[PDB]
Design a protein around this ligand. Sequence first.
Ligand SMILES: CCCCCCCCCCCCCCCCCC(=O)OC[C@H](COP(=O)([O-])OCC[N+](C)(C)C)OC(=O)CCCCCCCCCCCCCCCCC
Ligand SMILES: CCCCCCCCCCCCCCCCCC(=O)OC[C@H](COP(=O)(O)OCCN)OC(=O)CCCCCCCCCCCCCCCCC
Ligand SMILES: CCCCCCCCCCCCCCCCCC(=O)OC[C@H](COP(=O)(O)OCCN)OC(=O)CCCCCCCCCCCCCCCCC
Ligand SMILES: CCCCCCCCCCCCCCCCCC(=O)OC[C@H](COP(=O)(O)OCCN)OC(=O)CCCCCCCCCCCCCCCCC
Ligand code: SF4
Ligand code: SF4
Ligand code: SF4
Lengths: 43, 82, 115, 55, 318, 176, 185, 114, 156
Amino acid sequence: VKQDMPPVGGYGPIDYKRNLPRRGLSGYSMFAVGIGALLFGYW
Amino acid sequence: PLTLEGIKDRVLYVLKLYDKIDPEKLSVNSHFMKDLGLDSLDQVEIIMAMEDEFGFEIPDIDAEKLMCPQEIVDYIADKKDV
Amino acid sequence: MNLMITLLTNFTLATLLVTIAFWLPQLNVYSEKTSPYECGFDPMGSARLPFSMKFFLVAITFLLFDLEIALLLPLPWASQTTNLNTMLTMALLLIFLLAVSLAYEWTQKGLEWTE
Amino acid sequence: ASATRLIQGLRNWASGRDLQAKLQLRYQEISKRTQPPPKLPVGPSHRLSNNYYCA
Amino acid sequence: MFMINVLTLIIPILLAVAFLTLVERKVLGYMQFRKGPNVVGPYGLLQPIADAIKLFIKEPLRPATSSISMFILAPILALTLALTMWIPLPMPYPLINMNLGVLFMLAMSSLAVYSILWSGWASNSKYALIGALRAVAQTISYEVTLAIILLSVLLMNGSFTLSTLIITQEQVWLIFPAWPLAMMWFISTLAETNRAPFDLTEGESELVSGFNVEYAAGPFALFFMAEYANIIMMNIFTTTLFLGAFHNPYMPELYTINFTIKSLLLSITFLWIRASYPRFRYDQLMHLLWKNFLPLTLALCMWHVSLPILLSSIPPQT
Amino acid sequence: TYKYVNLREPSMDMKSVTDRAAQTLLWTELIRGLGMTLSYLFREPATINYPFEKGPLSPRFRGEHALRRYPSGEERCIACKLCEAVCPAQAITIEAEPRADGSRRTTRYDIDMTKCIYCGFCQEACPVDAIVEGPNFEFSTETHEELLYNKEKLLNNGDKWEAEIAANIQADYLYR
Amino acid sequence: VRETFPEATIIKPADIFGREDRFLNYFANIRWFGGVPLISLGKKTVKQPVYIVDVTKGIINAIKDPDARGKTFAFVGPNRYLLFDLVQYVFAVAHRPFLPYPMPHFAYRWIGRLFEISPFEPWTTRDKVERIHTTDRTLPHLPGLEDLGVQATPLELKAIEVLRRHRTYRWLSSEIEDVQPAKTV
Amino acid sequence: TSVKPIFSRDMNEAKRRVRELYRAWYREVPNTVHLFQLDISVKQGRDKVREMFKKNAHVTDPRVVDLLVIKGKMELEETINVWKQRTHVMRFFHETEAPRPKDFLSKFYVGHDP
Amino acid sequence: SRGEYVVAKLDDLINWARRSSLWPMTFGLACCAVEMMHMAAPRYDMDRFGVVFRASPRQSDVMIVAGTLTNKMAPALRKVYDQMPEPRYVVSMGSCANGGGYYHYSYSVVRGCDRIVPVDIYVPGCPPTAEALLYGILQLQKKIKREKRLRIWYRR
Ligand SMILES: CCCCCCCCCCCCCCCCCC(=O)OC[C@H](COP(=O)([O-])OCC[N+](C)(C)C)OC(=O)CCCCCCCCCCCCCCCCC
Ligand SMILES: CCCCCCCCCCCCCCCCCC(=O)OC[C@H](COP(=O)(O)OCCN)OC(=O)CCCCCCCCCCCCCCCCC
Ligand SMILES: CCCCCCCCCCCCCCCCCC(=O)OC[C@H](COP(=O)(O)OCCN)OC(=O)CCCCCCCCCCCCCCCCC
Ligand SMILES: CCCCCCCCCCCCCCCCCC(=O)OC[C@H](COP(=O)(O)OCCN)OC(=O)CCCCCCCCCCCCCCCCC
Ligand code: SF4
Ligand code: SF4
Ligand code: SF4
């Protein structure tokens, strides 16, 4: 028969989970950048 | 509240304000249902006109028994001192 | 002089953008297009009923912190004085008393609303 | 998938993800709109024998 | 020849508002994966003319129940205070170079609330009343930081003159010493001019349109081009406070192009915030500018009072 | 076989507490949301250019109704009233009598296009494929009674769209 | 029309008032112009306004009745009024200020060419002046609304329905039992 | 013949409840004319309320007049709270309807109705 | 004549201004509200045509009656339409708003929204697709384009 069927090896696996890539610096790095900007502006 | 005659005059004035009451046939001892020929609804809006004039709430068990202006002015004499 | 000319020009071509918006289009007015809008239905009462301000204590305390920004505001000029430690003490005194007022409004549940 | 590599790299950075592998705009990867003729199978009771309906 | 100087100021910032409507719709479109207007003219350049002509030929609809005098006076004062806050802004030489133009800007920010306020009161509807007292609840929150942040940024300037504020930033941008005041002034100017996430007076989903729910076309347009003129003015004001460019007195056009493009980038930043954020509940606005921004604002006020004294960097008052 | 959304107990060490306080003060997730919006700023938008482009469809699409014909000129409708019987909105009115050659044909075949719910029971109930629900959806009218088709408008729509409905039924009738 | 079509039902409505009229909407929309001008305070001309639903039901009953062929009907209202107390009743239903003044024939026909200098829809004209200050003639011999089975509805039962549109806000919550009805003649 | 009552034991308490409902509507009619800004008078409204009460004047069944009291209270609550509009109150005054035939000869003239 | 050409170009300008920036009001009732939101969605995209939502009826031009008109929302619809400033337009979307639809014989359905408001463009379907609704809006623009307001005023 010729019918809507999945292919020979099935389909590929499908991701269904969360992926949040964890970008950005650390907290210490961000406060260091901010306080260094403060000190350069003050000088 | 001062005189019973003034209360009876105010009662008859409120009764002659209403349209369906004949001011000739209206008396102190006229019956609303069997003499004047009124329905119950006419009598109940008469009693609510009495509430609007005298200014107090009249319940239903003692407005059921108001079939003549005699009992009207006597019950208003009951609710006040006079 | 130039400030009054500027304000008069702004008011003039701000009121000549209004009166050319009335006499130019076609007015077909009947007494349902001018009724109040209560999302399609009739209004329940009037719109002049008292809309009770739950945020009334903060509404008063805005005045007492708006007098602060009349007192704290001459500080770019008071930096220019020759008596500077007293100026520093009075300025930090005023922001310190403002913050004590803000903390007393904090902890006694004043910045929150009623009900 | 017509965006040049500077906009593509800026877009991958600002999303923080990899976008050209999973595009929401469809391209040549979809099925063709003109399909071959199907031949659907029949039900299990399409039989010329033992087809008494009460059973 | 001062009248021509006023007209060549306030006519282009009426054309820039009309094209800010187009930039608003198209940037809001492309950031929301669709397109903006591109059918009316060549890639949208004529949709502002359509919005200009269509509104001033539609029926004005004065309501019956509305107190008509305040109802007409409110958009007049709206567009007047949208126009008159452009005159001390140095471009690099302002129209009216006031000694204390910062206080002129702050005071006309204070007076511009009453257009919204009289519009929500006079247009006799319940949604307009809610939109007027939410404007009260918004203004009592942003005016109690809009003075201290604007004050503590000037403690490195010395005076309340906007033309001096280029001389102050001739070496470094002023965002580098006062970036918490910058990132808090930015939210104070968001919550000032009723832009998302602090719409809250034209709250389109709590109310219908809030204070201007009764304003049909014509009188509505003088709040439309008032609010957009105020946000372009406010981007130019934040640019002159924190990102004041290089000024050659022989070539003012370098400064003019530079703060033009910085103000365009901050207006695109406003459109890029409005296309991204949920809207606050308006008590959260009040519990932000009082409970969160205000203690750090007072702390940085102490810091910027004490710090030029601490560093012998007390600026000149001349 | 179940999972707990929002049952994350956050860590209470000074590193992660400093990270969350940096998230609070310096607004990390706000920059994340603005970055995702900026990433959608630089894409190709999915706005097709109607009316010079058209929305993608299928040959099964349910649009404007039409009465077809055989490839001899004869109309297919043999007046058997199944289409008005299964019609869930009762939009079809059929009145029939023998015509001048005695064949069983209709005299009134009305489809009220404003009662009609376009569900396609009439194109599957018709034993001769007379009534079909063709491809046309751009048949909006300026007046209500122009959406009350008689037999004549349906035969004219069949003569109009036969060059498409024949190919659609040719591509589709093996599933039916 | 009578001589070229011998059965033409000619109908004479006296003066029609309604929602989209130019009779009460004219008397109410001279309020902020300067004080409702009249000639000799408008106590010299007499009107009887007929209500528009009565005129429309008269037209329906003229279509229905074969006896109503070729007649000349005169539709009038039940109450006749002077113009002065009519305008009293108009400015007393709308709850408006009212300070009338006599504008004589020296210059009240010239306020036409002073007040239709625009080519648009005219507010007043000299024909409107000559028709508002024209009395309604009485023609008792003609059949009226009584002779087509129509009860003529007077002014006072529908004037609030007409003129609620012009009240500002301060007496929109008023009643019909507040204004005393105008004097008939 | 022994069924469960609704609120009234016999006709007397039922007449008391009908009477109090008529009291409530007699008090209600001026407010309904006022706040809905109708075009009717209090005389006309109270005579229409009298007609609506006398429309059901033939019932001697206590449960039926109890349900009529309850449905009148529903009409009253939909009128005090502004849930009816101007149109839902003016549906009682059938004004747009043409005058219907009553006698035999006009019903003979217009149609086949008995 | 000359002034005929003047009022012709003025009609062309104001009819172009009205058909070029039609502002629909946020009015959905039933299933057709979903497809009208698809006509706002980034595929079919009303906003490229100058077609943008204003929730207030005071500042809208076309009222797309997208859904079914029951008895309980007939005066609400009429008051909403009455609170739209002239010129105002009405597009009847879907079969229930057109002529009663699938609930035509029901006890509490107003059989078509032309019994309540004047209707300009009837868009048929159940639901009409967002492309078909967009076709109805562009046909409304073709209807506004051949208006002759100032030409008839000059010729009246
Ligand atoms: C000026 C031009 C633009 C500049 C760039 C701007 C880019 C970012 C734009 C963001 C737009 C966001 C739109 C509105 C967002 C509203 C929500 C929000 O964020 O609310 C504010 C949030 C609110 O926090 P919250 O609401 O999450 O907190 C909850 C609070 N309770 C528990 C009470 C309910 O954060 C703040 O209020 C912080 C304000 C800024 C902090 C800046 C700190 C600077 C560093 C100081 C020193 C620290 C080190 C220690 C001492 C060192 C001394 C040397
Ligand atoms: C510093 C610069 C500031 C600029 C600000 C504004 C920016 C955008 C300006 C507009 C951009 C281009 C717009 C083009 C519109 C389409 C023109 C057109 O072709 O219209 C055709 C139409 C019908 O003509 P038809 O005879 O049918 O043509 C068929 C040909 N066989 O014919 C018509 O519609 C009639 C002719 C219309 C012409 C309109 C021209 C544009 C007007 C815009 C206002 C600004 C004017 C210029 C200002 C700067 C210079 C002083
Ligand atoms: C029905 C209701 C009313 C309807 C009408 C409404 C009218 C318009 C309302 C909007 C305008 C309100 C103006 C309020 C006062 C503003 C004062 C001002 O601009 O001050 C700033 C500035 C200070 O700078 P300075 O240090 O003096 O620098 C000059 C040195 N070369 O000052 C200067 O530089 C000085 C320049 C000269 C100043 C002249 C006097 C000021 C103008 C007052 C006009 C009247 C204000 C009326 C306000 C009504 C508000 C509703
Ligand atoms: C004495 C001589 C003068 C007499 C009085 C003249 C008064 C002003 C006249 C302005 C032009 C009027 C004519 C308007 C267009 C008429 C022709 C037409 O129909 O053009 C249509 C065409 C677009 O076709 P469309 O069907 O919309 O496109 C669908 C997509 N294929 O449209 C286009 O291509 C664009 C149309 C643009 C129209 C002109 C630009 C706007 C008007 C500018 C001037 C007025 C503005 C006043 C101030 C407003 C604020 C700046
Ligand atoms: S599509 Fe459905 S509702 Fe329409 S005519 Fe066919 S059977 Fe009837
Ligand atoms: S259209 Fe088909 S189902 Fe309907 S009567 Fe004709 S032949 Fe029969
Ligand atoms: S016409 Fe049909 S599909 Fe459309 S809204 Fe109505 S019920 Fe839903």
